[PDB]
Amino acid sequence: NDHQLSVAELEQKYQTSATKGLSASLAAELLLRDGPNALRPPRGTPEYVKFARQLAGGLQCLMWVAAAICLIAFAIQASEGDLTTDDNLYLALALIAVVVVTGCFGYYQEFKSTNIIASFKNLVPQQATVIRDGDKFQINADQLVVGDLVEMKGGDRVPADIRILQAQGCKVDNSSLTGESEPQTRSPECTHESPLETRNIAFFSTMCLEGTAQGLVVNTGDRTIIGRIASLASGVENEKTPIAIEIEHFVDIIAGLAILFGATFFIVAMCIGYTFLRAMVFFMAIVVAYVPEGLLATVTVCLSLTAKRLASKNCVVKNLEAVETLGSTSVICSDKTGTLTQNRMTVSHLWFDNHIHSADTTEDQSGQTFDQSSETWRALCRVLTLCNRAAFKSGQDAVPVPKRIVIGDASETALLKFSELTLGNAMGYRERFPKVCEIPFNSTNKFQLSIHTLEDPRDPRHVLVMKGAPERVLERCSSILIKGQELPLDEQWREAFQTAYLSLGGLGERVLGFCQLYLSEKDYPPGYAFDVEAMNFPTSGLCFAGLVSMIDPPRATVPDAVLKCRTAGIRVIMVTGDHPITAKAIAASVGIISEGSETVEDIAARLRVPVDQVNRKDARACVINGMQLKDMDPSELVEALRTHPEMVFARTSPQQKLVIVESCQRLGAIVAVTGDGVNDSPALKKADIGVAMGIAGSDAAKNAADMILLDDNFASIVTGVEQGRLIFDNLKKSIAYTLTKNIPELTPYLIYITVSVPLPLGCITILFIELCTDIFPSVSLAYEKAESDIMHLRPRNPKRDRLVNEPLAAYSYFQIGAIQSFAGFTDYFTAMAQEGWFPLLCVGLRPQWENHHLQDLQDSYGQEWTFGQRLYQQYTCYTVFFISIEMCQIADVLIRKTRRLSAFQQGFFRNRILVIAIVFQVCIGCFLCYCPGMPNIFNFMPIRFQWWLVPMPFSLLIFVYDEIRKLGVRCCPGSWWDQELYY
Amino acid sequence: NPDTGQMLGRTLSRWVWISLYYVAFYVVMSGIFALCIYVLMRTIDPYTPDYQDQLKSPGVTLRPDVYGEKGLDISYNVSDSTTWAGLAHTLHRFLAGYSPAAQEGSINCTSEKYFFQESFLAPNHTKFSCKFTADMLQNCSGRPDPTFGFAEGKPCFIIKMNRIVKFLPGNSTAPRVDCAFLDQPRDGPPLQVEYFPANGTYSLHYFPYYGKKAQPHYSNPLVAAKLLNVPRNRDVVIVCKILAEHVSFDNPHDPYEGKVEFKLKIQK
Ligand SMILES: CCCCCCCC/C=C\CCCCCCCC(=O)OC[C@H](COP(=O)(O)OCC[N+](C)(C)C)OC(=O)CCCCCCC/C=C/CCCCCCCC
Ligand SMILES: CCCCCCCC/C=C\CCCCCCCC(=O)OC[C@H](COP(=O)(O)OCC[N+](C)(C)C)OC(=O)CCCCCCC/C=C\CCCCCCCC
Ligand SMILES: CCCCCCCC/C=C\CCCCCCCC(=O)O[C@H](COC(=O)CCCCCCC/C=C/CCCCCCCC)COP(=O)(O)OCC[N+](C)(C)C
Ligand SMILES: CC(C)CCC[C@@H](C)[C@H]1CC[C@H]2[C@@H]3CC=C4C[C@@H](O)CC[C@]4(C)[C@H]3CC[C@]12C
Ligand SMILES: CC(C)CCC[C@@H](C)[C@H]1CC[C@H]2[C@@H]3CC=C4C[C@@H](O)CC[C@]4(C)[C@H]3CC[C@]12C
Ligand SMILES: CNCC#CCOCc1cc(Cl)ccc1-c1ccc(Cl)cc1
Ligand SMILES: *[C@@H]1O[C@H](CO)[C@@H](O)[C@H](O)[C@H]1NC(C)=O
Ligand SMILES: *[C@@H]1O[C@H](CO)[C@@H](O)[C@H](O)[C@H]1NC(C)=O
Ligand SMILES: [Mg+2]
């Protein structure tokens, strides 16, 4: 492009001049041809479309269909002499109301999370310096046009994509756009083929760190690198979450069961003499009966509780479905710069006393320190403290040293912070050692020199301190300091120094050499005229103190978080735009590459053989750079991924990060992406869950992510994994509990239709069971603890381990639900018999029972009943069936606490929320039964105490049966019993 | 998912085992339910119900009972015999059960007092029940008027009280029927009724009812209310109340408790 294209061939495409620039009229006309030099906002999403999205969903659509079927049944029963059809309207209204209120709750959660995330979003107006027709005036950044002449200096933001023509010590921060952690030199010459790698292109969103530069605008607005990344992210489609897929599968199961049951009883109704309309109404009644109305509310509440628990650890989800994804995640593709690391140059290693030392690089200084008791260390510390010009901003006592703001470049800032952490009061020490001469850093000599005088009044010498490149320093420095000595260079120190230099270089660290010399008081008396131009002072024959190396180090919690993730069976891949050596060093530091793992290059270097003669299967680790990835087809990428468990992708473009995520997803994995910069936003959008750093994160990354770590704490990923697995298990338990009670609510209606007994259970009491009495106990199961070491399990197989499966459905519906139905019918017949209606007389009684024209119908004792008296007896039947269901649901919630462990092992009362929910359920039941006016308001009756006791043996049977079943599973791990009776 | 080897994710042998397990489960549950019902029915008393929570006050029914939109509605034409032929036939069918041949299993009672029986002295371990014949309704018995006064515009309505085991209406005086206009028309006098038996009483010796097993031949005593001054070609509402110490007729949710109300129109 323009970078491999000289200023002669430039100025013709852009009709500009390197010296003058653009004419005012030409600039104003280009500003009309193209738009302003600005990025388009992410446009759309009106406030009601989000609510419509909340109203949509799998369970929501099932409920919408159920309500529509209710309406159709009401219409059909109004088109004939059925009537008495307020039940359909009540149920349709309940379904719609539950859907609407749950949608309101979800919308409120997303709105609150959006406000929380935007609370940490700022805004600033951007200006630029431009030279048009010879006048160097200031201008707004978006006024710029392609071909404009632009001037930038240290501390300014680059105003557009610019091809550098002049540069004097210019460095830029590309860590957000690229993965490069170290400041990058900008020079007016082509250094690489790609525009992302050359030194003569400066990019729109980046910050100039130091120096000055001049260049020509080559791209503007949405056509810049960041604009093209934003365009790429806009084209990435967000997929369904795993929990949404599981809910859809469960809805399919419910629909299939409803269809089968309804068709069977449609045929039965045909065969026992019903009309076509009657049988169709029965079929639609059964189909609607199989839809659980309160389950959507239960699921929403459980997800919200998990979200609140995560937010207690500063982990904020943008939607409720995201609280589960980390539990199912099997691959984490992590960004390096700013995500795994602090994105801050800090002192990591030192070389003095013929030893390589390690410093504490953690931002909270929780690590280990090196040996600070030696004359060599004292000399090295004095040299690195004195040969420094950086300074802390005034008034920074509260903020810790690694977070303090410093006026200086990255290397000097790191040296100043290291001085503050080791010696303390670096600036005070500096002013206690006054300076009398100084040669700043420049490229002719590639070092920096300064002269000071001693603190003590009894020492007249002047101390020379020099800092610079290790080889430039070693060309000087005839001597070396080793344990209170000044040993001359015996070429053994030279070879040792070279070995240390390449060792620290291979660790991917920038290395600097430090040295000192003590000037004589005779040759250099006090008040000596040190002349920078005369070069009188000795710049040779120095004494070498030591080497100091720097790296952008990992965040403190990152290595342990990575280890825990890999213990949980999750594969961790590093995907960075940074350089391969630094990427490999950091991957080894954080645990992505394990100790002893080797690449093919490492194996070849060890075995003294060319790499092409090294077996790939012996290399556990692999480092692939972007140029190799470009040539690779998807088959080769898949082969490499399956061949090498410990994978690092370095110098990776945003598109290639997206490609890697897509390849991992095609292999069948649920993929999480952690990132902070703009270069991560497309991969974040493509990920099943995207996690962005709250503080380090760019706006594009935070907008693309589903989860935000507000405190930049990487261990929140581990917390999310544990909570996702826990919520998966507890949702399983809660769904089983909710589904169990649908069978005892349906079977009385089937018996009513086929045997024609008086109605045992009403629509209103069913609504009360579904929406009032059972929701709190169902929600209380979200507080159950894990039944095993959940963090040592492997990630679930998405295609095999479903949230709701056949064993769960079969057990809940047709064993526990069947027992509850039997309990309810026992209570129903007891209440009828003790009030005068024997069971055989109840069979076939429904027409006479419901006949408004029979006011003296005889019971088993010959007593004559009015219609109103029979209706009150029917309400008593409603109430006893309701109480039977409630009593059995107490045992159901108790047995639902565990799937494998005994209730005695897990603890009956450890879940105080569950205990409170049981007490609350019983209290509401008593209130409904015994509040005055209930018989005529909700048709509950003040039932006799023995109706309470009749279902209790059935509840005990439920508990004992489940306990025996789970003891069979524990004692016989992989028997037929475990295969069929475990869920 | 259907296949040859594994049908719906199960081999044919596995289907057999899981199906047999479910069959055993449901057999055990059905046996438990049957045992519960058997125990209940063995605890049930064959003569007296355990509770009468819904039977605090007896219902009241009327014959002939023709229902309209909301409740009893009787309308006919004195000129056209076809209009009241069905009503007369209904009354005849009802009194077939009070014919003297139908009353063979009962005895003559004259005590005019509660007929308390603590032993089963009647045939086949049974308690005695008192006789009620149609002739005790006299003019409204179907003889000598087979139209029950409908032809002459003075129809007979038979009021019957629902029977409750061991219920006692009150023994200071016999329970009595009282029929009146619900809203007395301002164009005429109040309702004039002649009752059969005289004063419209149910004799106390018809109480208490001991149930169907103890008294298989029990017959509810009847009262006939012959309306004498119903205006012609007008819609009137008539309520017949039971006046007894233990019979209440103030239930907003049961309009048949202790009383019966019907619409009547007699056209000419
Ligand atoms: C997929 C498999 C489903 C299986 C469903 C259950 C199947 C079994 C259900 C019914 C079969 C009979 C069960 C009852 C057995 C009764 C035991 C017994 O020996 O009792 C005797 C009584 C008669 O005694 P009595 O009155 O003459 O005594 C009077 C006493 N004195 C004279 C002193 C007053 O005989 C009776 O009552 C018989 C009454 C039986 C009919 C009741 C109405 C049927 C309703 C059934 C609904 C059940 C639903 C279950 C939930 C399904 C969940 C999926
Ligand atoms: C879990 C705890 C929740 C607590 C919620 C707050 C507390 C509210 C509860 C009660 C406060 C009011 C209490 C009632 C007034 C004082 C008592 C009274 O003055 O009694 C007079 C009568 C008694 O009637 P009775 O015994 O003859 O019954 C009929 C029996 N039969 C079958 C035999 C013919 O009352 C009548 O006549 C009918 C008069 C109207 C009905 C009573 C008024 C209150 C009832 C419903 C209001 C809304 C409650 C539902 C809220 C949503 C669902 C939870
Ligand atoms: C878990 C913590 C629980 C803490 C306590 C819960 C709240 C209790 C508060 C109030 C309930 C008692 C006061 C109202 C009832 C008397 C009103 C009345 O008058 O009832 C009358 C008779 O009463 C009784 O036979 C007894 C009443 C109480 C029965 C049991 C109460 C529920 C107890 C449950 C404990 C279960 C524990 C085990 C399971 C849970 C384990 C954690 C009913 O009238 P009737 O049928 O003669 O009317 C006939 C005329 N008709 C129908 C037309 C109106
Ligand atoms: C007649 C009624 C009570 C049912 C038949 C008897 C029941 C209780 C017994 C008798 C034979 C038993 C089966 C014998 C063989 C197997 C194979 C085993 O791998 C699973 C259990 C299973 C399937 C048993 C289930 C329970 C069983 C069916
Ligand atoms: C109890 C009555 C309705 C049984 C009538 C016969 C038919 C419908 C029964 C007999 C055996 C039964 C099966 C036994 C075991 C299983 C395996 C379970 O994973 C899914 C359902 C399933 C549970 C049942 C489906 C229904 C079934 C085929
Ligand atoms: C969990 N299952 C509960 C149930 C059930 C069985 O029929 C539903 C039902 C029961 C009763 Cl009492 C009254 C009306 C209905 C009903 C009828 C028609 C429709 Cl379109 C929807 C509902
Ligand atoms: C009842 O019958 C008697 C004689 O059978 C008669 O005198 C009397 O008038 C009748 N009463 C009515 C209202 O018809
Ligand atoms: C029925 O009664 C009406 C009075 O509204 C009368 O006009 C008519 O003639 C009567 N029917 C016959 C068949 O006379
Ligand atoms: Mg980054």
Author numbering:
A (entry chain A): 51 to 1033
B (entry chain B): 23 to 290
Please share text taken word for word from the publication where this structure appeared.
The molecular targets of acid suppressants, H+,K+-ATPase, is a gastric proton pump that mediates H+ export in exchange for luminal K+ across the parietal cell membrane accompanied by ATP hydrolysis. The catalytic α-subunit (100 kDa) comprises 10 transmembrane (TM) helices in which the cation and inhibitor binding sites are located and three cytoplasmic domains (the nucleotide-binding (N), phosphorylation (P), and actuator (A) domains) executing ATP hydrolysis and autophosphorylation. An accessory β-subunit (35 kDa) has a single TM helix with a short N-terminal tail and an ectodomain with six N-linked glycosylation sites, and is required for the folding of the complex and membrane trafficking. All P-CABs bind to the luminal-facing cavity leading to the cation-binding site in the luminal-open E2P state, and physically block K+-entry to the cation-binding site, hence preventing luminal gate closure which is induced by K+-binding to the cation-binding site.
Although the two crystal structures used as templates are almost identical (RMSD for Cα atoms = 0.755 Å), at least same conformation, to our surprise, generated candidate compounds from each template structures are distinct. Others showed lower apparent affinity than DQ-02 (IC50s for DQ-09: >2000 μM, DQ-14: >120 μM, DQ-15: 49.5 ± 4.9 μM, DQ-16: 89.4 ± 13.5 μM), and some compounds gave scattered values due to low water solubility. Regardless of the low apparent affinity of DQ-02, its double reciprocal plot analysis shows a typical competitive inhibition pattern (estimated inhibition constant (K i,DQ02) is 4.65 μM), suggesting that DQ-02 binds to the luminal-facing cavity as other P-CABs do. In both binding poses, the terminal secondary amine moiety reaches close to the cation-binding site, as seen in the vonoprazan binding mode.
